[PDB]
Amino acid sequence: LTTEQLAKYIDHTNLKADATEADIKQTCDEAKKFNTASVCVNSYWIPFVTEQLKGTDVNPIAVVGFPLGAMATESEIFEATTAIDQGAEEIDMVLNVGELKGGNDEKVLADIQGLADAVHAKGKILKVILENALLTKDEIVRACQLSEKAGADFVKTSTGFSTSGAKVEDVKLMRETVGDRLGVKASGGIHSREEALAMIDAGASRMGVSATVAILT
Amino acid sequence: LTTEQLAKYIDHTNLKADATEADIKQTCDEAKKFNTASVCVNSYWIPFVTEQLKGTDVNPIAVVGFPLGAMATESEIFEATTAIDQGAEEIDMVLNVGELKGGNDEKVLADIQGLADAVHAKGKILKVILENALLTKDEIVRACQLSEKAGADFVKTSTGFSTSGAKVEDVKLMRETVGDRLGVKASGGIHSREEALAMIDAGASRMGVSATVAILT
């Protein structure tokens, strides 16, 4: 796998609360240099990222209700539709973990479905961050099933803000659960080329990476 | 300070991503038992908290654009006014730390001003979480002054999700900066009644606390 085609798996990510305009521009510069799939940012930076990436193949994408996944669904929808309208091409939402752990599958479903409807109405795609760190293995499986039922296009491992991120065995469990019907995005704590390749081998079809420069050089 | 009057300083807080309905209910049960000022939750739980606290003097309050403070201003505003409409009496927003660190004060101010105007239009009050852990001391001062200028009613130390929370020296600095013109809320890592009293003496007029039971017993 060449650096160019590895880059195509990567949503180059910068989500730190203290990222400055200069920090965000550098992330954009890096993504354009390596031609990654996307630049992934918090919704405030979407207009700027869109401007920076204009005329390139790199897509701006946004997280929403992130990283806690406990934002009211209607407010998540507003954040998502605004982000898409301002240039986002994909939306990575966060699972309502508390409702899943509490066994309220119908509420978990309603939450994702509202985002899926809004995102798909604009012709874009939706990823659901499971936050595997906070889930039992059975819950990881259930979260994938509900994500699929609600119409999500991808399941994504982690926000990068919990106690751990992408794990080879979790990625494999996710890929087994969704089969080839949804994408699987390994994210969080991916620090080396070897780790990136292992996630792809475990079944990831996309990756969230912030240490992208170190991995591609 | 009586336990009953100490409770009136406290926004009893449960913001964890894996908080279930039962977890949130327990937080409401505790706040009602000790008559705290508020129950503070992520916006998804505002209708439930409002129902649980109905007929009592405990206020539901919501965080917004939380904890990263990097949500588009218009989306923070919608999250806030939606939360108020569902029963939130106060809104704790997060500073746009990235724009503050970048020295872009006009954007920091415009961000807080949008929330202040929207929250005040509904007759409610706004707290601005500075996230002191991420800031230089001059930045804490500037953040306080920008919050004051934008019309905020409180400055608040921390989200509870960064590297550190409320520090006595930071609280003093905040109180000195806003004088008696704004409230000062100490939050994050307040674990003992002794620590709580310390925060009050350093100048806090309100506190965010999760270990509320331990503290009040």
Secondary structure class of B204 (helix, strand, coil): coil
DSSP string covering A132-177: GGGS-HHHHHHHHHHHHHTT-SEEE---SSSS----HHHHHHHHHH
Cβ–Cβ gap A86/B98 under 8 Å: no
| Longest alpha-carbon distance in chain B | 45
Q: How many CB atoms lie under 10 A from the CB of residue A162?
A: 18
State the Cα–Cα distance between residues B185 and A210, nearest whole angstrom.
33
Instruction: Work out whether strand B154-156 and strand B183-187 pair parallel, antiparallel, or are unpaired.
Output: parallel
Query: Amino acid identity, residue B133?
Result: A
Among residues A161, A153, A158, the alpha carbon closest in space to that of A140 is found at A158
Nearest CA distance, B173 vs chain A (angstrom)? 21
Residue A43: phi and psi, rounded to 5, are -60, -25
Q: Would you call B96 an interface residue with chain A, using a CB distance cutoff of 8 Å?
A: yes
Residue B115: phi and psi, rounded to 5, are -65, -45
- Please state whether the peptide bond connecting residue B67 to the residue before it is cis, i.e. omega within 30 degrees of 0: yes
Q: Would you call B87 an interface residue with chain A, using a CB distance cutoff of 8 Å?
A: no
Burial degree of A121 (CB within 10 A; 0-12, 13-18, 19+):
exposed
**Residue found under tokens 């008696």:** B180
Among residues A196, A217, A200, the alpha carbon closest in space to that of A209 is found at A196
State the Cα–Cα distance between residues B210 and B215, nearest whole angstrom.
9
DSSP B172: H
Cβ–Cβ gap B98/A17 under 8 Å: yes
Among residues A18, A68, A111, A46, the alpha carbon closest in space to that of B62 is found at A68
| Chain B residues close to A42, C-beta within 8 Å | 68, 70-71
Q: Are A53 and A29 in contact (CB under 8 A)?
A: no
Q: Would you call B134 an interface residue with chain A, using a CB distance cutoff of 8 Å?
A: yes
State the Cα–Cα distance between residues A167 and A188, nearest whole angstrom.
9
Q: Are A192 and A216 in contact (CB under 8 A)?
A: no
Taking CA–CA distances from A79, the nearest residue in chain B reads B75
| Longest alpha-carbon distance in chain A | 46
Q: Which residues contact A187 (CB under 8 A, 6 or more apart)?
A: A11, A13, A129, A156, A157, A158, A159, A160, A165, A166, A207, A208, A209
Residue B16: phi and psi, rounded to 5, are -60, 140
Q: Would you call B13 an interface residue with chain A, using a CB distance cutoff of 8 Å?
A: no
Secondary structure class of A40 (helix, strand, coil): strand
Taking CA–CA distances from B81, the nearest residue in chain A reads A75
Token pair recorded at residue A93 = 């939402």
Nearest CA distance, B4 vs chain A (angstrom)? 31
Q: Per CATH, the architecture of A1-217 is what?
A: Alpha-Beta Barrel (3.20)
Among residues B205, B98, B105, B186, the alpha carbon closest in space to that of B150 is found at B105
Of A43, A99, A134, the CB nearest to B72: A43
The resolution of the experimental structure, rounded to one decimal in Å, is 2.0
Q: Would you call B50 an interface residue with chain A, using a CB distance cutoff of 8 Å?
A: no
Among residues B154, B144, B66, B85, the alpha carbon closest in space to that of B116 is found at B154
Which method resolved this structure?
X-ray
Residue A92 is among the residues annotated as catalytic for this protein: yes
